[PDB]
Write a new protein. Structure first.
Lengths: 232, 225, 232, 232, 231, 232, 226
């Protein structure tokens, strides 16, 4: 069984520049670009999903120490502390409570004074009002296509510049063209490295952003559990 | 998959370039080996070219010799070269002496052309007789056939003016080229040998050419590694 | 005809490591990763699929020994069976019967008790309500793409391992060029072994996922048929 | 110049075995599986498609004697006729005529009873209410991908098996090399033959499936216009 | 082996529709691929400025607005909504018409501040402002078309490379060496068309979704203006 | 700079038949089928697009001279014009225009007579009612896939048929083996030609169909631009 | 839902993989051509190596068979030539006759019997091309009735050849034996002083090394054409 070497999977990033003089330098630049694009969109997605998570956690911590019945006295004492945070926002979790706290009707069953919703809360607390820029964002959904495509561009550029070096013909010396083809084959391994990284980072980002989405909707439904158990 | 198929197409092209480049080198290595196999048959090629040279060169001079025994032996028939009956000396008819010089000149010119002696091991001047038993100083046909080969070989030394002498030519190994043989009537071409025209086909001078044979290293080098 | 051995398609999982030194070690690493990803996502898909099925199946057992004539006095006998299983759970099967009960109206015949609905059962029992976690799950829908691209990475890596083994140029002996071709064959075997598992596992998950969707939809229609049959 | 026969593409199913030992036995089994998958999914498609066609055909069969001025004298008998086939049938064609009936508001056009609808008949007779099992069926829409990927699996399976028996390396003799090539060609025969059938069966089902949908949608439109004609 | 990225730019001088050389053919593909990109960039820009112009008007015609103009602007906005919509029963005015005709008249105190009964969110959001660029099936297909154009160049390049590749008995080295040149010539077509086909596919795909988020940036900025102005 | 021959890409159709005896004839037949399939779907798309445009322009010509003050006294002429174009059909645009009129109610503005509408021009002049099988046609949208499939079947059939009868193995001479292998390689360009045509026509049709959709939609919007202008 | 994914793009990666394997066989086919050439040459080396081992086994057993009989012969020229020195087989000075003591001629018989037995044992003449019975003299110019050393050297080889023809009874006679073809195996020739083993000719025993009978064995050509 032949031994294989895989240390070439990792490019050398020490001599990175935007004017690569060799195919190895060009391959390293594209892997670095694809890594940077992946990190920029991960940070964009990760920071702006924690923003969604923090809004959810803030109100959950405002409803955790409540039993089934201790909601009439909390119906309004929760309202004042909402305004202390709601100021300044456009459609934040504070105003999202504002539009919902007002539409609870007050039912009077004698000594059964309670609170009840008049319709389903699916359009009040959901992924639209809280996750407005992650779940339906098609720029984020286009990132793995970007990452694959940058790897593809890097590979075909590496292959094309490998071929343009070739002085070739039927009238060219055979030993010359044997050396030329050998260099093309050697450079093809380095050229295809960007596609390996491009596809790998495309898959990793694809998995990561759909994992964050399923995590976001886990709490949004988890949030609706508290809403439909304390606010019938 | 659209970009995956495009990438796989790029791999196919690179492997196609490598496959054809590999085939180009392997092809050339084949004619190298093929050429080397033909070099191993060059000694037998040189022998055949010597005999055709002698026959053709003498044929232009109305001198009949025959290439016999798988293109290895230059037969000189009695119709071309006849000794006196029971004697090792050619007759004094001032024509056979001229006749035998041109065979030596032809023999010299064919061996030295393209330096084909580099492929020769030994050239034997062979004397052959018919079954007619004679006494010949007690030596019989065994001494007669031997003495006739020596008689021919002596004339080719001291009556042809070839600049590289026949007696000086070496072989593939650097040793001297020529040897003298006599076989009496034990190597007859005609076995029935009834009529005088059949006994005469046994009275002949045979020039046998032996070539060098390739060594182990010649075959090992022919692998072209 | 020559005999074939299908065990050449089986990877060797005994010597698995993340530092493969041979082609078969690398191909078995890729197949193990693809299998592990497949198994994990099957478990995740089955975890939420069985959740929906068990959630539906409880009603089927609760509605099995019921006919047209006995619905009059099964209104509240089924109420405590739904109540006991709806402890705190927000929008599961237990609360849907709670939401379903209030929309049941009595027929004006006076004598004999018959029950109807003010709206069709589709608004009460459907994919959006019972199985919205698996039908629209966009992480699940991306799993075949994950497995496909994992096999593609193995394909590219294997083929460019074969590219590295090539010995070209003038003045190269036959044995060395033969070894280079053996390396190309070795790399191609890695590429095709990872591809056949990547594609096969991708198709298996793709079919299994869409088979689970149709099975759940067949179970939801069973509720739609049985509930509306008993409650016109 | 070389002669070809298209019958070479038909596998021999006489010796089908689930443990194939030769190249043709494996390619025949692989094509047999692909045919079986194609036939099972055509049966699944036709099972649901005929169910849609019968629902539309019957209600068409219940409307051709009806002209604009004969709707009033025949409006009520259809409701009884709809009850005739609708024993249960929570969402059958008989039930679809039900909900349409109560939405036909009655107006007086001087002296002749005329029936109008406040909505459009396409709201009740469309793909969702008639052919939801075939139009948006994700399993059926994925069948062309399954069959194509089957053919792709046969390629990597065939190529891997062929290359696994190709023994190169120092000391391998001509007989062993010559047998290795035969195995590689046998593997290539498996690869291309399964791709021929994988893609041909894929595109056949692809075309057949969408031909069925266009045929069904044509009958749904023939249903919408006739009902609009009868009930303005 | 030193590379120059300038080798990736084709020669567009002697373009023609009958390319006799591999360079001319690859140049033709890049020219077509570039041409398709520019027209689809213009087609994207043309249908995007209209969306911006609708949003711009509600921002560039409400510069003399302050908080204290809750009601006396309500009537004057009505005829200026009809000023551009000269008989059009659609467009940005039609969104304002429904929003203006469904405003209840509230009474608190001496001052006449007006209150809504439903949020402007569902009336002035994406599915009615930018539906010609967000759900446009042709624009969505442009990056796939640009990539598929490069794939065509690859297949034609590979087919042209195999066209002059002859192997087997009776083929000498010079003929095979000419086959290498033909494969390389086809490969240059394949690689160059994919470089440009995919790069322009990236550039359009990223540009297309930069315009979209810029469209939402104006839609939100319009919506945020209305929210505090019109509670 | 070597010359290329693009005329080789176009195969000879002089001796087309459905019984190919050579690989060249098989390749030509599949290119012909792919072209024929492309033309039939382009002809159908052009036929179903021209009729929409031709019948929209009949209403454009009728509505072109109209003006807001002209509509009140000109309405009845169009209804006469609609019944001149529509002789009783329930499909043509003339029937759409007459069904539009009943939705027009009369408003009172001072003393002038000016007509309004209750529904919108999109209710009667939209893709569904005007270009039904031009826009939401899954069969048309699958044609680029059909073209891709047909081209690659031709290539797989060509490759499989070139390998199908090759006598290989240890009992076969090396020279015979090289003739068989070389024939397969030399025939690859013949089989591959159908994939070039399949992909090229697939891409062309995909672009062509999506242009016709935009052109038809642009005429729908223009039609309802003028209708809503004259009938607010 | 209108647009479905195009599932046939994956078939082109399928196609490219199969096309890759086809071009691998194009290079592998040449490998087999080159491998077959190497085996054909290897077959000739082993066939020639077998012939050369048959050569030296012939020479070892001739020397060993004669050694047991107090007859000393030499294996010279790298296991190729059987040398019969003057100390073993001594010709009368200036003559091709042998002494009439009935003991010298018996040794010449025994050399021919040993020579015949080694060639005919294990069919070893099938590996031989020609066996040369070689007459050699020293550089001393002699008359020999005008024939000189050419006559003397050839006559001495003939006299040995004639003794083996009549006075040893081996069932296939040495003059009837054939080589790997049907050609006669044996050649008898004289070389005079043209192929001396000693060149300086200084002393008597140095000159005596040239008066010898050489039996040179040549093996068949392995016939590279397989
Ligand atoms: Na296949
Ligand atoms: Na390309």
């Amino acid at each position: 069984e032949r031994q294989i070497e895989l240390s070439w999977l990792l490019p050398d990033f020490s001599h990175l520049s935007f004017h690569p003089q060799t195919g190895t330098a060009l391959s390293s630049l594209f892997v670095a670009i694809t890594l940077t694009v992946t990190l920029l969109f991960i940070a964009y997605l990760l920071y702006k999903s924690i923003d969604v998570v923090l809004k959810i956690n803030w109100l959950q911590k405002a409803l955790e120490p409540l039993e089934r019945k201790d909601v009439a006295q909390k119906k309004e004492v929760l309202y004042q502390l909402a305004k202390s945070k709601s100021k300044g926002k456009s459609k934040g979790i504070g105003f999202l409570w504002m539009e919902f706290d007002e539409t609870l009707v007050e039912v009077r069953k004698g000594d059964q004074i309670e609170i009840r919703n008049t319709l389903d809360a699916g359009h009040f607390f959901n992924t639209y009002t809280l996750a407005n820029s992650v779940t339906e964002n098609r720029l984020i959904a286009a990132v793995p296509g970007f990452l694959t495509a940058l790897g593809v561009i890097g590979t075909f550029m590496g292959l094309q510049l490998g071929l343009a070096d070739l002085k070739l013909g039927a009238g060219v010396d055979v030993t010359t063209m044997q050396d030329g083809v050998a260099g093309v084959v050697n450079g093809a391994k380095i050229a295809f490295l960007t596609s390996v990284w491009g596809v790998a980072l495309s898959v990793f980002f694809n998995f990561f952003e759909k994992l964050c989405e399923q995590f976001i909707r886990s709490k949004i439904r988890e949030l609706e559990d508290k809403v439909d158990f304390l606010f019938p | 998959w659209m970009s995956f198929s495009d990438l796989m197409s790029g791999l196919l092209v690179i492997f196609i370039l490598a496959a054809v480049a590999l085939i180009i080198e392997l092809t050339q290595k084949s004619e190298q080996i093929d050429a080397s196999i033909e070099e191993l048959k060059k000694a037998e090629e040189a022998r055949r070219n010597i005999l055709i040279d002698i026959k053709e060169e003498l044929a232009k001079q109305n001198i009949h010799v025959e290439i016999v025994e798988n293109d290895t032996v230059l037969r000189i028939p009695e119709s071309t070269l006849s000794f006196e009956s029971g004697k090792d000396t050619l007759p004094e008819n001032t024509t056979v002496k001229n006749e035998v010089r041109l065979i030596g000149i032809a023999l010299h010119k064919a061996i030295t052309t393209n330096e084909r002696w580099k492929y020769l091991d030994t050239v034997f001047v062979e004397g052959h007789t018919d079954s007619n038993g004679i006494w010949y100083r007690g030596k019989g046909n065994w001494g007669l056939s031997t003495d006739r080969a020596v008689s021919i070989w002596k004339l080719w030394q001291t009556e042809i003016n070839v600049a590289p002498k026949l007696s000086v030519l070496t072989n593939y190994n650097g040793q001297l080229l020529f040897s003298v043989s006599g076989y009496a009537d034990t190597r007859r071409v005609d076995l029935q040998e009834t009529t005088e025209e059949q006994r005469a086909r046994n009275r002949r001078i045979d020039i046998r050419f032996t070539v060098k044979k390739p060594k182990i290293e010649d075959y090992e080098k022919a692998k072209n590694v």
